[PDB]
Design a protein around this nucleic acid. Structure first.
Ligand SMILES: [Mg+2]
Ligand SMILES: [Mg+2]
Length: 958
RNA sequence: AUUUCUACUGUUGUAGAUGAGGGAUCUCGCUCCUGGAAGAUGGUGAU
RNA sequence: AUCACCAUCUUCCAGGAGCGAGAUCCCUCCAAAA
RNA sequence: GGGGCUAUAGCUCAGCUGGGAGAGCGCCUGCUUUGCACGCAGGAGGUCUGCGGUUCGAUCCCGCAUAGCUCCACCA
């Protein structure tokens, strides 16, 4: 669909021949070398108009409600500071030249601190309940004597444990500490955090006020820095092309003036196997900066002239109309003076801009930008030495791996644009792909952790990197977001969604999240909607015409020996077994052998649904098992973190002990885990004898017992972290326990128990079961958690989640293209949008839940096609997602969202049938998911897509 | 073995993804500095 | 046996700064002619 | 534990409309038969679930806490 301008930051490597921290910066355009800071003068007035507060409206900045008694006290406390003509602000800003101001954020901090300080001295010195109630601690008063004493029970016990001086046996001292830090100090804090009603409220009133100030502080902070960033440009830059390779030439501004005066005299003869280059351009934004920039000071020379064309002065004079601006600017270029200082193709701009008429201000910007961007050429011989000698020009060479290899065709996308920029087919489109005129250079040191241990490498020696920015679709409308109001974004999305049409959409996907199968995919079409049950069943059955083709590895253990005597396994890297060129080269097999292997190892078939847990794109084929290793790194990092964050990381010795087991031994552990898996309220009501039967339910095989159904109704209601923990489970679980005593003895006290890891069958292809050695390695207590060292394992939970998404975006984008070039139309991505409360729960039951990342990486992908708008603040528009509405739909471009209510338990053909039916609809209709769907779990994604498509078309009807 | 990441990895490297820099608020884990309170123990002086 | 003082030293609380992990958020990336 | 409903005197409950705190049962007392007592009479009983806000005026509108049932969304 019609696109809009898009930017990206692509980089390469520079090789130095003549001469992280930003060692240098430069701009291609010769006129930006002496930039001046932007005119932010308008915004500063607005934010200054938002800092100031008037007391009386304070309590309207938060949802928290305070009674009148506290209401009067807090205002009274603040007023005591406003004497002597002070004025009130929402926060302290070290800018804007303000004086005699009182920071509301600071004052709220002070009263909270003093009260918490006073209440600590009171409780420790032994005063009584009725003595507290008469004091001025209006925040901590009114707590029940149930809480007041409960706090003091810990306090005396804590101070009573401060007699560790008397101990002269470290073996016994280390046992003392754990009984102090964990059981007492960490428990007293929670009591005050979640049970003091008035205290909790003020813990939220202060936070929101701290966040509101934070919002308008960073906004102002970025305004200050810009005035420092514009100073650092130093060099005009050139690109000298030679034998198909580019060189990078710098030149300081002490010489840039003379060099251009010399270079412009050289012959633009044509093509002679060597060229020098230099860019020229003007743009709409730069024109306003020239006419109305810094006008109030009166030093804007473009306002010393040109005044005749003015409407009165200032941009606002045009009353916001579009066409009046157009005519004024045309007159600016139509005036003689402007044509005497500017450098533009007068005859073409005269013929194409000044005399024309535009229907909107957008087209005027494009026409101006379109025509003023030029790429000159001077091709005189032996133009290298003069720059080095006369112009003291530093020189580099632009190089990268793809730019050095021999074979072509396969090349990385960020190298696909650079080589596509210089082509002649692009120069005839007025540079649809554009190289913007500011660049920068960095220099990274080698990693000392790599030099010491050492294999060709990058980190083993320093590197010069070039960071550039390139715009695609340069001749489409531009869209920017800086300083929009958080309520204008919701309006921007609403307008952008008018592009799509009821008839344009031809299909839709559907994605379902989970924990046994991290993501499942399906597809739906309007053709599946026949009227009768017989036709509906028959139409879906034609999988050959609708579905997609997928490979499946047959024997994950299959390996081979290669041309160097080394051994290679299929599961580590299939792409050495699918690409014909690779198999022949490496294993030295013949053409007949390669076809024999392919026919034997890789099954194939066509299906409607798929599993995104392990699918990847290899040499043009979808391999459902091509990504096993990258899932192992996710069930490892989750395990390596849980057994590191359940230790105690004091700087001082402690006796906490933690050990791994495949099963649980005593009734203390089994009862402690069953409490960890159940609802606290519902579990507590369970009888003390019934609790042990409930343990037999979880940890033994139900087949060899007689749990009565009435008892099942309880065991099925007390459970909230679902799973299967028996010894005969499909993916047996691995356990970890914590205690202080040396040996269990079936009597020892135990503090926690937690499931860590899941033993998936496929993982045995990579690592043997004896590789819990590598899971265990990442737990310790001697490591204080404020050091980065050999134990650098924590860092990679985020980075390891983007690996799985990197493999689920290729598949989703590969299928999207496939169908668009077969049905001839765009389509919708659909996924349940269950708000943010359901998302946090999801991450709670598994650190590796991929929901929020898998969304934020779909917006990044489909913007390039112009299908979704630019996204400023996602949570502003789509928090508290749909719920309890089987018709609504939320839409950001083509990425819709729907209610997941009842999806996974309905037959695609019927409305009454349920799942868990053994692939045949229990209502006795003809549906059979035997060889339509990858698995019975695929019905959810199919239903999610099915519902999504109908809701969207329904909305467009009216 | 890579502009960068992930899995591999040296007879031309292979397969997927890739907008970077700097900064703000909050939650959890930890360290150093300054101040306040409760308290063991040696010693000293009055009683 | 009461009260005062020096000293080793134990715990808890407040404020300042710094390191590791997670969540939300913001700006910059095209201007000048003597 | 991620969305919804009710809660009036000791018990059961009418009343919930912004201009209005009540009924039956239970209890105490007096009356009283020979005797249970059919019966007569009066009294005690309220933080309108607890807390808080809005309003000229609130059991009535608005926001939190506890007690009861509902959803394969997360899964032997
Ligand atoms: Mg779902
Ligand atoms: Mg599912």
């Amino acid at each position: 669909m019609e696109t809009y301008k898009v930017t990206k930051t692509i980089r390469f490597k520079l090789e130095a021949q003549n001469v992280g921290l930003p060692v240098a910066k430069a701009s291609f355009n010769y006129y930006t070398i002496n930039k001046k800071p932007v005119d932010f003068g308008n915004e500063k007035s607005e934010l200054e108009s938002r800092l100031k507060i008037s007391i009386d409206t304070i309590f309207k900045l938060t949802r928290e409600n305070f009674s009148k008694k506290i209401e009067e006290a807090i205002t009274a406390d603040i007023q005591k500071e406003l004497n002597n003509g002070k004025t009130l602000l929402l926060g302290d800003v070290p800018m804007l030249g303000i004086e005699n101001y009182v920071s509301l954020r600071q004052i709220l901090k002070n009263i909270k601190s003093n009260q918490k300080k006073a209440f600590s001295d009171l409780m420790q010195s032994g005063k009584n309940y009725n003595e507290l109630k008469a004091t001025n601690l209006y925040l901590l008063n009114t707590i029940e004597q149930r809480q007041f004493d409960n706090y003091k029970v810990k306090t005396n016990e804590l101070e009573k444990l401060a007699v560790k001086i008397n101990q002269a046996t470290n073996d016994n001292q280390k046992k003392e500490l754990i009984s102090n830090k964990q059981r007492v100090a960490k428990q007293r804090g929670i009591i005050m955090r979640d049970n003091f009603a008035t205290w909790k409220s003020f813990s939220n009133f202060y936070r929101t006020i701290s966040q509101e100030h934070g919002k308008i502080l960073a906004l102002l902070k970025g305004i200050e820095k810009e005035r420092t960033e514009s100073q650092l440009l130093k060099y005009w830059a050139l690109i000298l092309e030679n034998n198909g390779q580019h060189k990078l030439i710098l030149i300081p501004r002490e010489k840039a003036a003379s060099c251009k005066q010399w270079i412009a005299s050289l012959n633009p003869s044509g093509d002679k196997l060597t060229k020098l280059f230099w860019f020229e351009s003007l743009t709409y934004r730069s024109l306003q900066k020239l006419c109305f920039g810094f006008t109030e000071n009166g030093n804007n020379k473009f306002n010393k002239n040109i005044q005749n064309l003015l409407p009165i002065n200032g941009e606002f004079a045009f009353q916001g109309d579009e066409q009046k601006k157009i005519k004024f600017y045309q007159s600016v270029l139509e005036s003689k003076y402007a044509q005497s200082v500017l450098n533009i193709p007068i005859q073409q701009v005269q013929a194409d801009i000044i005399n024309q008429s535009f229907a909107s201000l957008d087209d005027f910007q494009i026409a101006l930008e379109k025509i003023c961007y030029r790429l000159f050429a001077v091709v005189e011989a032996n133009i290298e030495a003069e720059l080095l000698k006369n112009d003291k020009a530093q020189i580099f060479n632009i190089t990268s791996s793809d730019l050095r290899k021999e074979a072509k065709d396969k090349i990385k996308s960020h190298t696909q644009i650079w080589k596509a920029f210089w082509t002649s087919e692009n120069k005839q489109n007025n540079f649809e792909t554009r190289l913007n005129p500011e660049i920068t250079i960095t220099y990274r040191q080698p990693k000392q952790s790599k030099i010491d241990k050492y294999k060709n490498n990058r980190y083993l020696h320093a590197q010069y990197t070039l960071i550039t920015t390139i715009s695609e679709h340069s001749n489409s409308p531009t869209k920017i977001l800086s300083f929009m109001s958080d309520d204008e974004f919701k309006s921007s999305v609403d307008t952008f969604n008018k592009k799509f049409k009821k008839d344009e959409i031809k299909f839709a996907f559907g994605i379902d999240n989970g924990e046994v199968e991290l993501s499942t995919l399906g597809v739906y079409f309007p053709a599946f909607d026949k009227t009768t049950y017989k036709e509906k069943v028959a139409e879906l059955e034609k999988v050959n015409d609708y579905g997609f083709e997928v490979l499946t590895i047959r024997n994950l253990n299959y390996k081979e020996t290669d041309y160097n005597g080394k051994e290679r396994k299929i599961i580590q890297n299939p792409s050495y077994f699918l690409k014909k060129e690779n198999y022949l080269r490496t294993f030295n097999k013949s053409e007949t052998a390669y076809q024999k292997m392919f026919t034997e190892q890789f099954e194939k078939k066509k299906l409607l649904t798929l599993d995104l847990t392990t699918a990847k794109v290899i040499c043009g084929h979808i391999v459902t098992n091509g990504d096993v290793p990258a899932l192992f790194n996710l069930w490892l990092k989750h395990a390596q973190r849980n057994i590191f964050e359940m230790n105690d990381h004091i700087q001082k010795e402690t006796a906490k002990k933690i050990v791994l087991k495949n099963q649980l031994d005593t009734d203390n552990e089994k009862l402690k885990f069953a409490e960890y898996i159940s609802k606290e309220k519902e579990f507590g009501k369970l009888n003390d004898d019934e609790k042990m039967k409930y343990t037999k339910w979880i940890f033994e095989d139900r087949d060899q017992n007689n749990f009565t159904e009435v008892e099942n109704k309880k065991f099925k209601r007390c459970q909230k972290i679902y799973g299967n923990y028996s010894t005969k489970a499909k993916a047996p679980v691995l356990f970890a326990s914590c205690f202080i005593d040396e040996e269990l003895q079936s009597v020892t006290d135990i503090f926690d128990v937690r499931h860590i890891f899941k033993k998936r069958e496929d993982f045995y292809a990579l690592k043997t079961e004896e590789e819990i050695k590598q899971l265990i390695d990442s737990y310790n207590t001697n490591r204080a958690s404020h050091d980065i060292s050999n134990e650098e394992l924590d860092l990679k939970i985020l980075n390891t989640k983007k690996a799985l998404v990197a493999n689920a975006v290729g598949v989703i984008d590969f299928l999207y293209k496939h169908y668009e070039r077969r049905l001839g139309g765009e389509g919708l991505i659909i996924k349940e949008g269950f708000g943010t409360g359901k998302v946090e729960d999801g991450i709670e039951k598994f650190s590796g839940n991929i929901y929020r990342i898998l969304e934020r990486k779909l917006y990044q992908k489909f913007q390039n096609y112009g299908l979704v708008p630019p996204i400023k603040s996602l949570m502003a528009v789509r928090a508290n997602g749909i719920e309890n509405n089987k018709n609504a739909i939320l839409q950001l471009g083509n990425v819709g969202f729907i209610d997941p209510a009842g999806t996974s338990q309905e037959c695609p053909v019927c409305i009454e049938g349920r799942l868990e039916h053994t692939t045949t609809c229990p209502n006795k209709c003809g549906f059979n998911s035997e060889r339509i769907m990858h698995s019975n779990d695929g019905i959810a994604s199919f239903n999610i897509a099915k519902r999504g498509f109908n809701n969207f078309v329904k909305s467009k009807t009216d």
